[PDB]
Motif scaffolding. Structure first.
Motif, mmCIF file in Angstrom:
data_model
loop_
_atom_site.group_PDB
_atom_site.id
_atom_site.type_symbol
_atom_site.label_atom_id
_atom_site.label_comp_id
_atom_site.label_asym_id
_atom_site.label_seq_id
_atom_site.Cartn_x
_atom_site.Cartn_y
_atom_site.Cartn_z
ATOM 1 N N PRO B 29 8.457 -4.956 -28.686
ATOM 2 C CA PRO B 29 8.500 -6.152 -29.520
ATOM 3 C C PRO B 29 7.361 -6.207 -30.519
ATOM 4 O O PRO B 29 6.216 -5.864 -30.221
ATOM 5 N N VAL B 30 7.713 -6.617 -31.734
ATOM 6 C CA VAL B 30 6.726 -7.082 -32.687
ATOM 7 C C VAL B 30 6.055 -8.324 -32.124
ATOM 8 O O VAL B 30 6.698 -9.130 -31.438
ATOM 9 N N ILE B 31 4.735 -8.438 -32.339
ATOM 10 C CA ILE B 31 4.015 -9.669 -32.035
ATOM 11 C C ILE B 31 4.642 -10.856 -32.717
ATOM 12 O O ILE B 31 5.053 -10.798 -33.881
ATOM 13 N N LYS B 32 4.746 -11.936 -31.967
ATOM 14 C CA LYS B 32 5.198 -13.206 -32.476
ATOM 15 C C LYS B 32 4.165 -14.243 -32.088
ATOM 16 O O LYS B 32 3.308 -13.994 -31.241
ATOM 17 N N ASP B 33 4.220 -15.383 -32.758
ATOM 18 C CA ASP B 33 3.489 -16.550 -32.308
ATOM 19 C C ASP B 33 3.990 -16.908 -30.917
ATOM 20 O O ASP B 33 5.200 -16.891 -30.685
ATOM 21 N N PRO B 34 3.108 -17.140 -29.949
ATOM 22 C CA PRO B 34 3.589 -17.613 -28.648
ATOM 23 C C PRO B 34 4.185 -18.998 -28.700
ATOM 24 O O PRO B 34 5.030 -19.326 -27.859
ATOM 25 N N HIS B 35 3.797 -19.816 -29.673
ATOM 26 C CA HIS B 35 4.332 -21.167 -29.716
ATOM 27 C C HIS B 35 5.719 -21.185 -30.341
ATOM 28 O O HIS B 35 6.690 -21.601 -29.707
ATOM 29 N N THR B 36 5.844 -20.709 -31.571
ATOM 30 C CA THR B 36 7.102 -20.798 -32.289
ATOM 31 C C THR B 36 7.989 -19.582 -32.115
ATOM 32 O O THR B 36 9.108 -19.593 -32.627
ATOM 33 N N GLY B 37 7.532 -18.544 -31.424
ATOM 34 C CA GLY B 37 8.335 -17.345 -31.271
ATOM 35 C C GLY B 37 8.677 -16.597 -32.548
ATOM 36 O O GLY B 37 9.757 -16.016 -32.640
ATOM 37 N N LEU B 38 7.802 -16.609 -33.530
ATOM 38 C CA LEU B 38 8.124 -15.979 -34.803
ATOM 39 C C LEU B 38 7.069 -14.962 -35.200
ATOM 40 O O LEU B 38 5.887 -15.177 -34.948
ATOM 41 N N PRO B 39 7.455 -13.869 -35.861
ATOM 42 C CA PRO B 39 6.501 -12.794 -36.154
ATOM 43 C C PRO B 39 5.459 -13.202 -37.179
ATOM 44 O O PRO B 39 5.542 -14.259 -37.794
ATOM 45 N N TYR B 40 4.451 -12.342 -37.337
ATOM 46 C CA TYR B 40 3.371 -12.567 -38.285
ATOM 47 C C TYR B 40 2.603 -11.281 -38.497
ATOM 48 O O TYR B 40 2.588 -10.405 -37.637
ATOM 49 N N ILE B 41 1.968 -11.178 -39.652
ATOM 50 C CA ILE B 41 1.039 -10.090 -39.896
ATOM 51 C C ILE B 41 -0.315 -10.598 -39.431
ATOM 52 O O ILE B 41 -0.749 -11.652 -39.903
ATOM 53 N N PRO B 42 -0.997 -9.945 -38.505
ATOM 54 C CA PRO B 42 -2.349 -10.378 -38.180
ATOM 55 C C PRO B 42 -3.342 -10.054 -39.271
ATOM 56 O O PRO B 42 -3.216 -9.080 -40.006
ATOM 57 N N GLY B 43 -4.342 -10.899 -39.363
ATOM 58 C CA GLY B 43 -5.444 -10.584 -40.215
ATOM 59 C C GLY B 43 -6.286 -9.469 -39.709
ATOM 60 O O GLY B 43 -6.959 -8.824 -40.507
ATOM 61 N N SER B 44 -6.270 -9.219 -38.404
ATOM 62 C CA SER B 44 -6.940 -8.040 -37.882
ATOM 63 C C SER B 44 -6.242 -6.782 -38.341
ATOM 64 O O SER B 44 -6.900 -5.780 -38.634
ATOM 65 N N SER B 45 -4.922 -6.829 -38.442
ATOM 66 C CA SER B 45 -4.114 -5.673 -38.782
ATOM 67 C C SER B 45 -3.997 -5.487 -40.274
ATOM 68 O O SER B 45 -3.621 -4.414 -40.735
ATOM 69 N N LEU B 46 -4.283 -6.523 -41.044
ATOM 70 C CA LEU B 46 -4.276 -6.399 -42.487
ATOM 71 C C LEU B 46 -5.641 -6.032 -43.025
ATOM 72 O O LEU B 46 -5.722 -5.275 -43.985
ATOM 73 N N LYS B 47 -6.713 -6.528 -42.422
ATOM 74 C CA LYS B 47 -8.055 -6.169 -42.846
ATOM 75 C C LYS B 47 -8.352 -4.731 -42.508
ATOM 76 O O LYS B 47 -9.115 -4.076 -43.215
ATOM 77 N N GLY B 48 -7.741 -4.213 -41.450
ATOM 78 C CA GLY B 48 -7.955 -2.823 -41.105
ATOM 79 C C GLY B 48 -7.291 -1.864 -42.062
ATOM 80 O O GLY B 48 -7.937 -0.948 -42.571
ATOM 81 N N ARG B 49 -6.015 -2.076 -42.347
ATOM 82 C CA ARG B 49 -5.299 -1.213 -43.271
ATOM 83 C C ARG B 49 -5.792 -1.383 -44.704
ATOM 84 O O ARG B 49 -5.669 -0.458 -45.508
ATOM 85 N N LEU B 50 -6.389 -2.524 -45.036
ATOM 86 C CA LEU B 50 -7.148 -2.641 -46.274
ATOM 87 C C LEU B 50 -8.484 -1.933 -46.216
ATOM 88 O O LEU B 50 -9.047 -1.637 -47.267
ATOM 89 N N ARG B 51 -9.017 -1.672 -45.037
ATOM 90 C CA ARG B 51 -10.247 -0.915 -44.930
ATOM 91 C C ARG B 51 -9.989 0.552 -44.649
ATOM 92 O O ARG B 51 -10.758 1.401 -45.095
ATOM 93 N N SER B 52 -8.901 0.865 -43.947
ATOM 94 C CA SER B 52 -8.482 2.250 -43.756
ATOM 95 C C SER B 52 -8.258 2.965 -45.083
ATOM 96 O O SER B 52 -8.684 4.106 -45.261
ATOM 97 N N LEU B 53 -7.610 2.302 -46.034
ATOM 98 C CA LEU B 53 -7.322 2.929 -47.311
ATOM 99 C C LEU B 53 -8.515 2.947 -48.240
ATOM 100 O O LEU B 53 -8.620 3.862 -49.056
ATOM 101 N N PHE B 54 -9.419 1.987 -48.140
ATOM 102 C CA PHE B 54 -10.535 1.954 -49.065
ATOM 103 C C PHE B 54 -11.653 2.872 -48.663
ATOM 104 O O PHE B 54 -12.356 3.365 -49.534
ATOM 105 N N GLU B 55 -11.818 3.138 -47.377
ATOM 106 C CA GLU B 55 -12.847 4.078 -46.966
ATOM 107 C C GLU B 55 -12.474 5.494 -47.358
ATOM 108 O O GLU B 55 -13.329 6.261 -47.810
ATOM 109 N N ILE B 56 -11.190 5.837 -47.228
ATOM 110 C CA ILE B 56 -10.682 7.132 -47.672
ATOM 111 C C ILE B 56 -10.823 7.277 -49.181
ATOM 112 O O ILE B 56 -11.167 8.352 -49.683
ATOM 113 N N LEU B 57 -10.605 6.186 -49.922
ATOM 114 C CA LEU B 57 -10.909 6.176 -51.351
ATOM 115 C C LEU B 57 -12.384 6.424 -51.607
ATOM 116 O O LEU B 57 -12.732 7.175 -52.516
#
Ligand SMILES: [Zn+2]
Ligand SMILES: [Zn+2]
Ligand SMILES: [Zn+2]
Lengths: 162, 267, 497, 286, 276
Positions: B29-57
């Motif tokens: 399963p994709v992560i969902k909100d435990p309250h509303t049962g709906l997916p989301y992009i985490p900020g932990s997972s977005l800040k990382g892939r924004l840092r994964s690509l910039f460090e390689i740059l």
RNA sequence: CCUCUGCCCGCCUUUCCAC
RNA sequence: GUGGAAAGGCGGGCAGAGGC
């Protein structure tokens, strides 16, 4: 072993796992509970652990048969979305219970071949309880099925299914 | 030594899952909100892939930026998988369990690193705090209504196994906040941030991605500056650089300092 | 506080001894008696047989006066010495008729003491006089008001000011490797570290001539290198410390950095169940003196034999995370006649607490049982927090049923502390099967499956979990045995990181 | 007698259970705030002459707890002569490590009659980690703070016997300032806060010569059976000297306590509360 | 010490994203009886004090006339020179971290920071003027915990080597996003000249916290707390003296911290300005 | 549904008491 | 005239790598 170690509540939950992994012993011992559960047309007629005890016998009645999971999930991932709308979302899920009984009628009409008595074991026991949700609330008298929803799913993995 | 405050450049906008979007957790399963049962992009997972690509740059450019950002005289392009030292002349100088990452070891080395001043460093004794904060991005309002009315928000995709994925076309709300701590270098830190987002529109987000689970695409709604004067007075007297029908490949493109002339007007 | 190291705590325990042997050896000397009169002297509680003259009672009331006034200038009512005496006859030294007259005459003395520990410093005559002394600073390590400054700079950090009697117990606590005893002599004399109420104690180190009238010698019955005019007092002490590579006693850190798994400071504290009712069937003074040495010798001298690992024939097979090493990392802080307080690695203080119960059970004939508290703590935890926890956690494993190990539902039908054979039968089964390569999600969720049972939804949840891997042999009765598996899981999880 | 049981329904942690010198120190700081220096001295003179407040003790939902008298410590063997010699050891130690008693059992212990002790203590003492962070680099300097965390319906209460014109004049105003200002340390993290209720408590007692106390007395003569308390608190940022107080349950004989005054180099002077709170008690022969 | 009245602010803290305030598989702190999470008062006071000292540090020039003793500090940390009370703003070394705490009662009466959060120094110290209570769950969310729903989650985060793509995951517990809390902040009107300033500074720092984060990770998304007020009541000195419910109530059930900081500061607190 | 990973690194109390 | 006064459990860390 046939109707001797297996008893009412919790006698042979641990010893029947090796016998189900047999043919003629489970064809007559598990047939009585699948008829008593048909005679259990009232779902909330068991406030004790009678459901969880009968969940082992129904999952043993589903063990020797197929019970494919891709037909199981969509019926039960719709049963959560009814529950997710219980949480201050809705109070009338009457329009979805007609579609809930239609997915089980669509399931037994699609699986053809060697999976007849499998899905008809599935079609036997739940239709006494799948009529109950229409003229009943959700804050009671549905949730007790939602415990017995996954009760039969889990031991069916424990006796060697999936 | 000397942490200041001048305002918070707030980047709002809406993430468009052009292809199906899978950020998993622990039939997969994709992560969902435990309250509303709906997916989301985490900020932990977005800040990382924004840092994964910039460090390689930054990993490919360590030679020609040590005059613009000093303290890159410490680093030579590489890693520390070949030899177990936490800090040698290589750029990926953080053990981080079994996988290396670039983290400068101190406040004042990271004050001139272009990476660790933006996404934040960590260190023994002195350490440097992050300047962007990335909230967890949920579904928008109009995709709540599609969940209210029986439109699919998820789908099972048989691959013999099932990778669940947030069904394509779905949109999420993402808020990025940048803390203006020094007026002399805010332009670079907004340019280096949108540089990291241009790389994400070509790379993917979450899940397998090389099998096409990415193609994330930003849709901007508002830049806001919010000076220090805004916090003292509740009046909505902050700069609103609208870029509503612009793309990240056009804001950072020439068209940048035309958008960011009014942040100058406050300094 | 957190400023006192273990060498300090180990020197607090070895200085309450010398306070106890200073008082007893002033009763024996001013009454003309010998050390055959000291029936027992065991963890603060000592009994002496003397004469009933109006000259003996006149001397005891100066000793009880000067010892309590000493214990008040030094320690502001933290420690009190209650001394009483019962004039017994000759016929009360043994059974007569059918009633035990000796135990009846010794419970008449236990009540004089009971009524005296209530009235705690009733011989000072300025106890409740609030005379206002000025300029009171305050020690960091122990908490003592000290008048007008006069606090020596600490030998560790000279930017902190301790009281004088902790610079002694650092120096004494540093000499504990070398120290072969103490010479007990006049208070104003060369080399005296600590002071008792009556005498002043020099350390008789190893390469060094003994000075003193009476020389106390730790843990041997051999008057080896004592002058032929001195008095020999042998006294036994339970003293196993793991060393450091320096000549010294290992730190709270340096022990716990050799525990396999997560790094914790293991703290055990326990005492003999129902001991005072054992000593009341002893009806003659030769029979009480027997029953009091043998219990003292177990805790003094047959515990350092256990930490060596000697006589695992009579111990057998115990819950062992690793096989018991050759030089364990266990520090014996205080070992009393009927109780003990040992610290060490969490790993080996666990096996020791079953290597102690099993040996005590055979040291008696079985007719006396133990009760243990066990603790898991971070290294840099203070002592007063740590010990107050484990003393309560020993008391928890006592008032239930008094024979219960503590290891690691709001109704009243459960109880926290495992019994001894209960935990040793849970460990025979559940542990040799799971000691599943990095399958800890099977283990850590199972503890969270367990913690719904405290709050039979758990049965099928375990059934799918044991099934969706294929672990059917593991835990067949787990699908109340879900309550009593928390001991074995939570330990073996710590043995693997 | 019939006392006034001031309940303190907590809104957080406390730092410790308030002893009776930190309740009078708090009232003296409330009445100096809402009235002034010329009413603190008329407050002390009503305790010197008249009224008595006690320490504070826990309650838990209509069961009120009171400290065990030390009077039952010797007689316990002669108390329990309807038992066998297997549980006359195990009743005898739990009835001696016991710290509190119900309102029903406390009335029995004064009569030297058998009792039982509370199964469950209404509060827990826990250590909560607190970290100081540098503003510039967020460096962490963790320290441990220990506070009293109560159960659902538990709290603490103290008692008051005296004239009613003191209670409405100086105590019921001060215990509404203290509800919003808190009692004890760390009151800026929401610690010693509470709501407040008032009740009518009756405690039966025997009539005798000796009397338990329910407050930390600073006795002129030596009492009968005591238990030392060696505390000295704080007062406007100066350290008080330590004072031998006697713990609750100590038996005195016709002793009025006493207030000690100190100077501490403040513009005013400091009165340490040390008055006793007598309840009559029946003793054995000593 | 010249007590006049106490201003009480009651509002609901709301977790728009999943709050995490740890303890040391990484637990948020919990009540040892109920087991439900809570927000401390040490952790909410000190996050307001922190964000506001960074606020004053930038403004050591403009505020020299409205606040006296702010001309003795130059903006920075006294970390470089291991001496306290040097000429910088962050001047007290608590253990290893340098915090602005004013040295003396007669300067801390004139700092904007140490007047509200208090200060400690030899020759007396300034006690704080606020009391930040602990923020427990509201009763709507006890009765979702009683109802059997979740109230915390277990989130799994991974770190990744950027060259080899090796993953070494860890799990944080965090409170479920949506959880409503209930705070209370009790200012102490010790002077009547500066009570408006101390309330406008307390609402400035609450507006910084609505764009910063409270607790935990925050740069990765764990903060996003939202303040929702209910009612501000000023308790007069006479109210305690009598216990009669005779106190000003500024009612604002649905207002932000920016809609109350300047939009209604003189329109809502006009009755508090009257009675002093 | 299969294969490696399943928490690291730190601070762990600092400072005030008017003869 | 309160065993008090001041003191954010945080800083950093893509649940991902191949598998039609
Ligand atoms: Zn860097
Ligand atoms: Zn000391
Ligand atoms: Zn200040």
């Amino acid at each position: 072993v046939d109707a001797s170690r297996l008893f009412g509540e919790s006698p042979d939950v641990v010893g029947i796992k090796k016998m189900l992994e047999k043919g003629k012993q489970w064809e007559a011992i598990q047939p009585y509970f699948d008829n008593v559960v048909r005679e259990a047309k009232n779902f909330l007629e068991w406030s004790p652990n009678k459901r969880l005890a009968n969940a082992v016998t129904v999952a043993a009645y589903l063990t020797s048969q197929g019970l494919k999971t891709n037909q199981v999930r969509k019926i039960l991932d719709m049963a959560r979305t009814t529950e997710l709308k219980v949480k201050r979302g809705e109070g009338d899920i009457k329009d979805d219970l007609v579609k809930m009984r239609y997915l089980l009628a669509y399931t037994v009409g699609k699986a053809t071949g060697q999976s007849k008595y499998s899905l008809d074991a599935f079609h036997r026991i739940l239709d006494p309880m799948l009529e109950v949700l229409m003229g009943s609330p959700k804050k009671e008298n549905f949730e007790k099925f939602y415990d017995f929803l996954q009760a039969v799913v889990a031991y069916h993995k424990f006796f060697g299914g999936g | 030594m000397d942490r200041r405050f001048y305002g918070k450049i707030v980047i709002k906008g809406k993430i468009k899952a052009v292809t199906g979007l899978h950020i998993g957790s622990q039939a997969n399963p994709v992560i969902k909100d435990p309250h509303t049962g709906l997916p989301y992009i985490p900020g932990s997972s977005l800040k990382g892939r924004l840092r994964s690509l910039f460090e390689i740059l930054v990993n490919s450019r360590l030679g020609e930026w040590r005059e613009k950002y000093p303290s890159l005289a410490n680093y030579s392009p590489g890693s520390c998988r070949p030899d177990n030292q936490e800090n040698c002349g290589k750029f990926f100088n953080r053990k981080i369990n079994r996988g290396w990452i670039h983290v400068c070891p101190d406040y004042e080395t990271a004050l001139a690193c272009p990476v660790c001043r933006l996404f934040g460093a960590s260190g023994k004794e002195s350490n440097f705090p992050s300047r962007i904060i990335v909230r967890d991005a949920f579904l928008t309002k109009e995709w709540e209504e599609k969940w209210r009315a029986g439109e699919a928000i998820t789908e099972a995709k048989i691959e013999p196994r099932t990778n669940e994925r947030v069904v394509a076309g779905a949109e999420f709300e993402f808020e990025i906040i940048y803390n203006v701590e020094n007026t002399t270098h805010w332009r670079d830190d907004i340019k280096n941030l949108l540089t990291a987002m241009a790389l994400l529109e070509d790379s993917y987000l979450g899940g397998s991605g090389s099998r096409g689970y990415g193609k994330v695409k930003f849709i901007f709604d508002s830049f806001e500056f919010r000076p220090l004067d805004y916090y003292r007075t509740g009046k909505d007297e902050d700069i609103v650089s609208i870029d509503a029908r612009e793309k990240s490949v056009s804001d950072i493109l020439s068209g940048f300092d035309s958008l960011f002339s009014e942040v100058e007007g406050k300094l | 506080s957190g400023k006192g190291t273990l060498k300090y705590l180990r020197a607090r325990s070895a200085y309450l001894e010398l306070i106890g042997w200073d008082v007893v050896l002033e009763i024996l000397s001013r009454l003309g008696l010998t050390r055959a009169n000291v029936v027992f002297n065991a963890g603060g509680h000592f009994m002496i047989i003397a004469q009933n003259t109006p000259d003996a009672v006149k001397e005891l009331e100066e000793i009880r006066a000067k010892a309590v006034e000493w214990l008040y200038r030094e320690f502001e009512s933290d420690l009190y010495l209650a001394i009483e005496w019962e004039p017994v006859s000759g016929r009360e030294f043994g059974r007569e008729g059918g009633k035990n007259l000796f135990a009846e005459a010794r419970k008449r003395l236990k009540h004089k003491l009971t009524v005296r520990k209530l009235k705690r410093f009733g011989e000072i005559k300025g106890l409740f006089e609030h005379g206002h002394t000025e300029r009171l600073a305050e020690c960091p390590v122990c908490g003592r008001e000290l008048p007008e400054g006069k606090l020596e700079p600490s030998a560790s950090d000279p930017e902190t000011k301790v009281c004088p009697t902790c610079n002694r117990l650092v120096s004494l606590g540093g000499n504990l490797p070398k120290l072969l005893g103490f010479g007990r002599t006049a208070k104003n004399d060369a080399g005296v570290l600590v002071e008792g109420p009556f005498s002043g104690f020099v350390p008789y180190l190893q390469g060094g001539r003994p000075v003193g009238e009476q020389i106390l010698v730790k843990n041997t019955l051999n008057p080896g290198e004592i002058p032929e005019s001195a008095q020999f007092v042998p006294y036994f002490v339970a003293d196993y410390f793991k060393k450091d590579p320096k000549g010294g006693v290992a730190t709270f850190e340096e022990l716990s950095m050799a525990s396999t798994g997560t790094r914790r400071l293991g703290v055990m504290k326990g005492d003999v169940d129902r001991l005072g009712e054992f000593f009341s069937s002893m009806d003659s003074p030769s029979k009480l003196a027997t029953a009091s040495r043998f219990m003292d010798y177990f805790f003094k001298g047959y515990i350092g034999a256990i930490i060596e690992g000697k006589f695992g024939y009579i111990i057998g097979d115990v819950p062992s995370l690793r096989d018991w090493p050759e030089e364990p990392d266990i520090v014996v802080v205080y070992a009393g006649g009927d109780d003990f307080f040992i610290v060490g690695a969490w790993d080996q203080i666990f096996e020791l607490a079953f290597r102690v119960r099993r040996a005590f059970n055979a040291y008696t004939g079985g007719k006396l049982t133990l009760s243990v508290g066990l603790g898991y703590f971070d290294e840099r935890t203070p002592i007063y927090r740590m010990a107050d926890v484990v003393s309560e956690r020993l008391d928890t494993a006592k008032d239930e049923g008094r024979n219960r190990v503590f290891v690691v539902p709001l109704d009243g039908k459960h109880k926290l502390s495992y019994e001894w054979n209960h935990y040793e039968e849970l460990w025979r089964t559940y542990a040799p099967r799971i000691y599943l390569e990095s399958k800890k999600g099977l283990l850590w969720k199972l503890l969270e499956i367990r913690e719904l049972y405290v709050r039979v939804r758990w049965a099928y949840l375990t059934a799918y979990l044991l099934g969706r891997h294929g672990l059917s042999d593991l835990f067949p009765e787990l699908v109340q045995p879900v309550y009593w598996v928390d001991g074995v899981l939570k330990i073996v999880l710590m043995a693997v990181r | 007698p019939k006392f006034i049981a001031v309940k303190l329904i907590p809104k957080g942690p406390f730092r410790d259970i308030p002893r009776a010198d930190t309740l009078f120190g708090a009232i003296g700081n409330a009445i100096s705030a809402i009235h002034g220096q010329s009413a603190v001295e008329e407050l002390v003179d009503a305790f010197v002459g008249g009224a008595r407040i006690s320490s504070a003790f826990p309650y838990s939902g209509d069961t009120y707890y009171l400290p065990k008298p030390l009077s039952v410590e010797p007689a316990l063997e002669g108390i329990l002569t309807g038992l066998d010699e297997e549980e006359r050891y195990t009743t005898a130690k739990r009835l001696r490590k016991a710290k509190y008693l119900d309102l029903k059992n406390f009335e029995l212990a004064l009569r030297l009659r058998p009792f039982t002790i509370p199964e469950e203590i209404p509060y827990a003492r826990v250590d909560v980690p607190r970290v100081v962070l540098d503003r510039v680099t967020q460096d962490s300097s963790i320290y441990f703070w220990e506070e009293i965390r109560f159960r659902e319906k538990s709290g603490v209460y103290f008692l008051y016997s005296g004239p009613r014109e003191v209670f409405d004049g100086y105590i019921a105003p001060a215990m509404r300032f203290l509800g919003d200002t808190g009692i004890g340390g760390k009151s800026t993290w929401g610690a010693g806060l509470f709501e407040v209720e008032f009740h009518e408590m009756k405690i039966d007692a025997p009539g005798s010569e000796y009397s338990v106390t329910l407050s930390n007395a600073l006795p002129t003569k030596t009492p009968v059976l005591w238990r030392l308390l060696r505390k000295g608190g704080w007062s406007f940022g100066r350290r008080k000297p330590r004072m031998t107080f006697i713990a609750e349950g100590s038996i005195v004989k016709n002793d009025p306590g006493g207030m000690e005054r100190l100077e501490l180099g403040l513009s005013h002077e400091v009165y340490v509360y040390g008055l006793t709170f007598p309840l009559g008690v029946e003793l054995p022969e000593g």
